[PDB]
Amino acid sequence: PGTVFVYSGRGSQWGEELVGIEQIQLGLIGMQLALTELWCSYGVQPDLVIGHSMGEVAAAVVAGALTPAEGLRVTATRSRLMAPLSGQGGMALLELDAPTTEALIADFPQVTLGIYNSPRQTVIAGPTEQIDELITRVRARDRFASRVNIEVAPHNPAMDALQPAMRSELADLTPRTPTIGIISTTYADLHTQPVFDAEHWATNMRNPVHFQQAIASAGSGADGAYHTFIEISAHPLLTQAIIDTLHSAQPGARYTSLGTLQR
Ligand code: NA
Ligand code: NA
């Protein structure tokens, strides 16, 4: 049937308190790497990995493209660069398809489509006050929208200024060809076979997250079909997005979507 491990970007976290983007993101990838090995111990191993947003670092590590130390180095480097933007940007989950979302935000230069969740769910990202105005406009149209609280909002033009620093501080990264299959969510073209280098991580933090497209490709018979998707997290937040994407793209197909832990 095929098993996919899905690594979320900003999953739930909560036994000492993790404080600030750097500490929180480090506890997240630490928990992802340790939960992945726990699954392996009970015979369950991934044939393919998909990383969502900041989760693509952990997915690149599990796939063998980067070492655990290299993954932690990307995590710490990126988190330190993003920290001065703490609280400035926000995200919103909209119950709109991607073309309707693009139309809604076309006149907001600082707000972009951040994540393709599923066909009828799209996340936007940008300055928190602009995200609030857009939530109000979506609600005023008798449509649904909700805030997605995050330490620093990636996948929007505020990340452009951090890309030179990323390309510079991660210059000596030595990624390898992955040992396990990985579908990147960084590029609209899923056949852009990516080298998981400095340029890839600088691009990944700014580009939209092509999550629906990566899940649909994994579920498709093209390049082999996978039927079990396991979110490797402390609480399942992407499971309904996985099912909504797969049911829409292959309506007569059977898929199983599950988490690792639950709060
Ligand atoms: Na815009
Ligand atoms: Na496939």
DSSP 20-84: HHHHHHHHHHHHHHHHHHHHHHTT---SEEEE-GGGHHHHHHHTTSS-HHHHHHHHHHHHHHHGG
Q: Tell me the angle at which helices 20-41 and 68-82 cross, rounded to the nearest 10 degrees.
A: 150
| Polymer length of the chain | 263
> End of a domain among 148, 177, 198?
148
Q: DSSP 3-state assignment of 147?
A: strand
Q: Do 26 and 68 sit in the same domain of this protein?
A: yes
Q: Do 251 and 162 sit in the same domain of this protein?
A: yes
Q: Do 171 and 63 sit in the same domain of this protein?
A: yes
Q: Do 162 and 143 sit in the same domain of this protein?
A: no
Rg, Å, the chain Cα set? 17
The CATH number of whichever domain residue 108 belongs to comes to 3.30.70.250
For residue 110, give its domain range. 87-148
Domain count, the chain: 2
CA distance linking residue 58 with residue 29, whole number of Å? 6
120 token code pair: 């009828």
Q: Do 163 and 137 sit in the same domain of this protein?
A: no
- Cα-to-chain-centroid distance, residue 222: 22
Distance 101 CA to ligand 1 centre (A): 9
- Cα-to-chain-centroid distance, residue 237: 11
Distance 147 CA to ligand 1 centre (A): 17
Distance 222 CA to ligand 2 centre (A): 4
> End of a domain among 120, 148, 176?
148
Neighbours of 139 (CB within 10 A): 12
Distance 4 CA to ligand 1 centre (A): 33
Q: Do 68 and 93 sit in the same domain of this protein?
A: no
Experimental method reported for this structure = X-ray
Distance 228 CA to ligand 2 centre (A): 12
- Cβ within 8 Å of residue 251, ≥6 positions away: none
Q: Do 109 and 39 sit in the same domain of this protein?
A: no
CA distance linking residue 168 with residue 179, whole number of Å? 27
In a domain? residue 263: no
Distance 111 CA to ligand 1 centre (A): 4
Distance 84 CA to ligand 1 centre (A): 23
Q: Do 91 and 77 sit in the same domain of this protein?
A: no
Q: Do 180 and 238 sit in the same domain of this protein?
A: yes
CA distance linking residue 79 with residue 126, whole number of Å? 18
